[PDB]
Amino acid sequence: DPGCSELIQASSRITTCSTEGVNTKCRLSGTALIRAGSVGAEACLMLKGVKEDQTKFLKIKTVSSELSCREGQSYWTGSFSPKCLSSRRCHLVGECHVNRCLSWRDNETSAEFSFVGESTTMRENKCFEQCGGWGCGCFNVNPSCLFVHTYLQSVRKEALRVFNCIDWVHKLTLEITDFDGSVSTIDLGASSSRFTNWGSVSLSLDAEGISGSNSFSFIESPGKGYAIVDEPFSEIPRQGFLGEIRCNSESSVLSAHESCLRAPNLISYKPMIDQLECTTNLIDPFVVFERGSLPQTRNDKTFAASKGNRGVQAFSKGSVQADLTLMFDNFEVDFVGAAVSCDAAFLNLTGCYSCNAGARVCLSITSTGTGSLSAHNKDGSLHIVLPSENGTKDQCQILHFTVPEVEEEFMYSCDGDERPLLVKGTLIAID
Amino acid sequence: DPGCSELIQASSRITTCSTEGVNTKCRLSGTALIRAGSVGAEACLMLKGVKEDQTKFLKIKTVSSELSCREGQSYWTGSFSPKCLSSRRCHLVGECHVNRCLSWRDNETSAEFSFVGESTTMRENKCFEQCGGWGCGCFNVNPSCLFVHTYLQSVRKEALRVFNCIDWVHKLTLEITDFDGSVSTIDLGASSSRFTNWGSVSLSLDAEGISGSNSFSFIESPGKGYAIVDEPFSEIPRQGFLGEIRCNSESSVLSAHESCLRAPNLISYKPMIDQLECTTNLIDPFVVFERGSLPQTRNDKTFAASKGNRGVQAFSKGSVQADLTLMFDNFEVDFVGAAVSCDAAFLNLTGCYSCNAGARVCLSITSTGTGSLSAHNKDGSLHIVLPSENGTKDQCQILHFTVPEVEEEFMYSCDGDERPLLVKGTL
Ligand SMILES: *[C@@H]1O[C@H](CO)[C@@H](O[C@@H]2O[C@H](CO)[C@@H](O[C@@H]3O[C@H](CO[C@@H]4O[C@H](CO)[C@@H](O)[C@H](O)[C@@H]4O)[C@@H](O)[C@H](O)[C@@H]3O)[C@H](O)[C@H]2NC(C)=O)[C@H](O)[C@H]1NC(C)=O
Ligand SMILES: *[C@@H]1O[C@H](CO)[C@@H](O[C@@H]2O[C@H](CO)[C@@H](O[C@@H]3O[C@H](CO)[C@@H](O)[C@H](O)[C@@H]3O)[C@H](O)[C@H]2NC(C)=O)[C@H](O)[C@H]1NC(C)=O
Ligand SMILES: *[C@@H]1O[C@H](CO)[C@@H](O)[C@H](O)[C@H]1NC(C)=O
Ligand SMILES: *[C@@H]1O[C@H](CO)[C@@H](O)[C@H](O)[C@H]1NC(C)=O
Structure with a gap:
């Protein structure tokens, strides 16, 4: 209306x-x-x-x-969990030779895990020095070596596209x-x-x-719908943000494929002699999706x-x-x-006085055909002319007043047969 | 034992x-x-x-x-939640004049919120441009100004000390x-x-x-013990870490006092013309405590x-x-x-061969008073002497073998005699 x-x-x-x-x-x-x-x-x-x-x-x-x-830009992400294997060797046994442990490279798999075979999954490798000596089962007093092999795995069988x-x-x-x-x-x-x-x-x-x-950035859940995200798109993995792990495809998220990119140091380790815990604290993008779901x-x-x-x-x-x-x-x-009659009621009067913008008056106007409502105040200084239609519409125009307290009686009609209408409101002064 | x-x-x-x-x-x-x-x-x-x-x-x-x-260093933290008030004025009205809204400063309270008055609480102020024109209730087509006043309030009547x-x-x-x-x-x-x-x-x-x-760093929950936190202590409040909001006292955390320090941009806003939502995603320090409690x-x-x-x-x-x-x-x-005899059972052999450290034999000894255990084990080459003690005690000593698998045999005589024993192992 x-x-x-x-x-x-x-x-x-x-x-x-x-x-x-x-x-x-x-x-x-x-x-x-x-x-x-x-x-x-x-x-x-x-x-x-x-x-x-x-x-x-x-x-x-x-x-x-x-x-x-x-x-514009796009990447896929999802939810992941680390799976770690560990094996501790005494100083001067296996790879636990003089400096290997402390200089261990992330991408080198220890001989301790050669039984795992070949992998195409996101993975990493650590060595943590632990206690040596007989109290920790070693002939040598020097630190033993807790070798660790970790891979990431997709926690869900679905992925999300961020763009x-x-x-x-x-x-x-x-x-x-x-x-x-x-x-x-x-x-x-x-x-x-x-x-x-x-x-x-x-x-x-x-x-x-x-x-x-x-x-803003957006998420697509294929076959499901979209979500908005109240943050700028991130072109680079950043720990603690959506996209900290990201892949070029839906299937690569699902297989946790090694082509996926990730921010550094996402997996935390608690080496405890022969015990080991590994954890992540990743942003859950399915939670982010549900928060912004369209x-x-x-x-x-x-x-x-x-x-x-x-x-x-x-x-x-x-x-x-x-x-x-x-x-x-x-x-x-x-x-x-031919003109037909209308009925009209005052709705509101809003805006400023003695300004260029003026004040907007709104009327509800009810008729049975197309026409014009005309209304004038007592002295003919103000005029309202608004459309009339079959049915009811709210119609508005600008009126120019020179006083903040408005209480102005108009007589209106669509066919010459006038009825009263009171327009009142309070308008603000500008500067 | x-x-x-x-x-x-x-x-x-x-x-x-x-x-x-x-x-x-x-x-x-x-x-x-x-x-x-x-x-x-x-x-x-x-x-x-x-x-x-x-x-x-x-x-x-x-x-x-x-x-x-x-x-060493210490700070107090706790759990907070924002409360915000908002008021929108059309362009050219009130404080909403080009170009104040976009230039607004966090510490400056809008005249829209005089009815709030005096405060010693953590707080901030924002202004967001929103749609102008008659469709958004304004006589002027330029952006209107959504003024916002926000304070943080303690959501728990308890605090945590990070040290x-x-x-x-x-x-x-x-x-x-x-x-x-x-x-x-x-x-x-x-x-x-x-x-x-x-x-x-x-x-x-x-x-x-x-x-x-x-x-490492640590947390004390007053009258409820301690927790370890698996990260460095930091003297700098940073978003998404413990201590992103920090204070000097138990009471200051509970009053969400203005002296508490806080990392930038912890409160997010959704201006929606005349509606406003404001939220935080602060790490919960009590969850951190729980997960690391000693x-x-x-x-x-x-x-x-x-x-x-x-x-x-x-x-x-x-x-x-x-x-x-x-x-x-x-x-x-x-x-x-004089010294009596004892019950000695073999336990293990552990070490290397042709090395400096060598093997380590361990025996279970249960005896009278305090004595000493001998073994005619591999005489002309090897011997074993260990403390006999009144009670049940495991005893170990060093041994040098220069063979991978060791299948040895002993007649132990602390008595001297009368007893037998066997030792077996491998490197
Ligand atoms: C003074 O009076 C005027 C006239 O009444 C007021 O203006 C009117 O403001 C209302 C409320 O904001 C506007 O209503 C909106 O309408 C849109 C329009 O949607 C379309 O309308 C039909 C109705 O038949 C709907 O069923 C359809 O959805 C269609 O999309 C709607 O999307 C909004 O949800 C809301 O209902 C209205 O459009 C507007 N009228 C005019 C002529 O501009 C004005 O606010 C008031 N001022 C005061 C009180 O200070
Ligand atoms: C070879 O046999 C000896 C048996 O003496 C083993 O040495 C023992 O190792 C265990 C640790 O695994 C020790 O037991 C522990 O006691 C401490 C303190 O009371 C306690 O904190 C531990 O929880 C645990 O109960 C024990 O001290 C130690 N004995 C000696 C004399 O050092 C050794 O591990 C065996 N090696 C094997 C089976 O490979
Ligand atoms: C590991 O990374 C190094 C450094 O880039 C590289 O030279 C080497 O080829 C990699 N080693 C592997 C995959 O075994
Ligand atoms: C708010 O910031 C402004 C800009 O420097 C400054 O003038 C004013 O003193 C600050 N308010 C304080 C410190 O309370």
Whole structure:
């Protein structure tokens, strides 16, 4: 039931009217700029004829204002757990020769674990010096060597794809009701223009986008849906962050393949003579997914999965940061039709006084056909002219007051048969 | 239950004996280096008399090897949660003028929250630009300003003290049984000597400290004991680590006091026009305490709360990384007199072959009073002499074999006789 959220009068300088003895028609030629309607509501342009009762409206409903994520970088991740094997040798036995233990290389497997065979899994190798001497079962008093071989294994049989958006492609869908009542639906992009019955329409300025977009990233769970993540995409594994372990494919997460990348020192070890514990404290990306699972709101946007060919989209919820440029190409409009009555009620009066922006008055208007409500205050200094329709709509325009305390009686009608309406509110002063 | 884990023989170098009359007496003079016995077990020195039936033992038990934490730096931490207030003003209204919102400073309270007034709590302030225009209730198309005031509040009425150990004080406690059998208990620090009836005992080498001590820290939960944390202490508050929020006291943590220090950006915000959510993802220090609550074992050590005092200690579990220097002040020992027989079962053989250290035989000995066990085992090559003790005790000594698999055979005669025994093993 929203009607005009934004309403401007076409400049007298783009309008020319003539009367054919009682029958008057006007031509629009030139350009008007109007802010796009808030989502669900209309941007409206009012045409005035020569008489005060000659009014027509062009209405442009913002059906939706959508932003589609163009995906940039991507990696796969999932959940992992370490499995360790250990074997302790006394000083001067096996590899536990003078310095080997303390200079042990991560990628070298100890002879102690040659029975494990070949591996293509993410893995690492440690040696921890432990106590020597007879109390720890060694003939030699020097430190014994706890050799350790560890591999990572996927804890789930599914994986998650983390990505960013390099661009958000704006599509503004508009439902246009011409002056003559004909309805059409169009869509526009930032650089688009469409021919209309009266000329053309384009986006003069389009600043629709995701503010702080570099601080969002997304997760896809294949066959399930998407999640938002409230952090920038990480191009490098960083311990304690999503992506600290990452792979180039879904299957490589699942097999924990050695091509996967990982941040250093993710596995902690507690060597205890012949006992060993190894643990991880990894970010659980399935928890992160469930925390951000779509749909979600951030700022004035709703992020949701695309219906159909899948990706993520964001929808504006309120204002649309775009101006429509309306080009009229010598287009004729008449004022034909019988007026019917309307009922109206005051809704609100909001904004400032003695300012350029003025104050927005909103009325609920109920009728059985298309027309115009006209209202004036006692002294004819203020006038309201708003669309009337079959059914009920909330309709708003700007009024200019010079006082913060407003209590103004208007008489309104759609057919000349006036009824009272009280507009009141409190407006702020600017500086 | 365990006896001599380390057995050395008194060097003929520091030994002089003779038989002038009705019996034989021996004199010990000089130093003798011996490895400390494993905790609970004994380091042992055998005195060889001029006969074969003449043998005496000096026994030194390791009762405990103990390391006490000398606490260094400390901080208090606990559990916190944010509470935030918000108020949005349209562009050109109130404080919301280009370009103050985007320039807002954490310490500056917005005039939107005058009704909160005076505070000594941890707190911050933010401003977030949000949609403008009539669709977001504003007469101006420029961004509106969501002003936010947030304070941290304690979510638990208890705190935790995180602390560091700048040094670990070593005390070694030895129980000495002299050749004549008199018992004695001494304590040694890393530098220390103690005099004995026969001379003295000193810590020659002492490496009983905590390896990797730089990567440990500790927590005290007031009146509930201690925990070990498997990471360094840090004097810098960092996000995602214990102490990311820290204070100087129990009360300050509980009041979420403004003197508490905190790492940057711990509170996250979701501005949603007129709605706002604010959250933290702080590590829970009480979970950290729980997971590390003492007693805990690391390496060859048990970390535990001090028994007769306040603080934490670590106790050596296996080998003691220390050499004992024994000094003998021209000390005389006699051998009188008779000694019975005992039940000795073979236990094991362990070591290498054709090496310096060699094999180590261990026997289970149950006997009368205190005696000495001999073995006619492999006579003309090998012999075994060990302490017989009133009770059940395992006794070990060194042996040199130059073959891989050892299948040996012994008739042990401490009696002398009457008994048999077998020994078998491999390197
Ligand atoms: C003074 O009065 C005016 C007019 O009443 C108020 O403006 C109105 O504000 C409301 C609440 O924010 C807006 O409602 C929103 O409507 C959108 C529109 O969605 C579309 O509308 C149809 C209704 O038939 C819906 O069923 C569809 O979903 C469709 O998408 C909706 O998405 C929001 O959830 C919300 O309901 C309304 O659009 C707006 N009207 C106009 C003409 O702009 C104004 O807030 C008020 N000011 C005050 C009280 O200070
Ligand atoms: C060979 O046999 C000997 C039997 O004496 C074994 O030596 C013994 O080893 C164990 C440690 O595994 C020790 O037992 C322990 O006692 C301490 C202190 O009381 C306690 O803290 C431990 O929990 C455990 O109960 C024992 O001290 C030690 N004996 C001696 C004399 O040193 C040796 O391990 C055997 N080797 C084998 C079977 O391979
Ligand atoms: C281990 O890494 C070193 C250093 O890059 C490399 O030279 C060597 O080939 C690797 N050794 C393996 C895989 O055994
Ligand atoms: C807040 O930060 C500003 C910027 O330096 C400073 O002027 C002000 O004194 C600070 N407030 C304090 C220290 O309480």
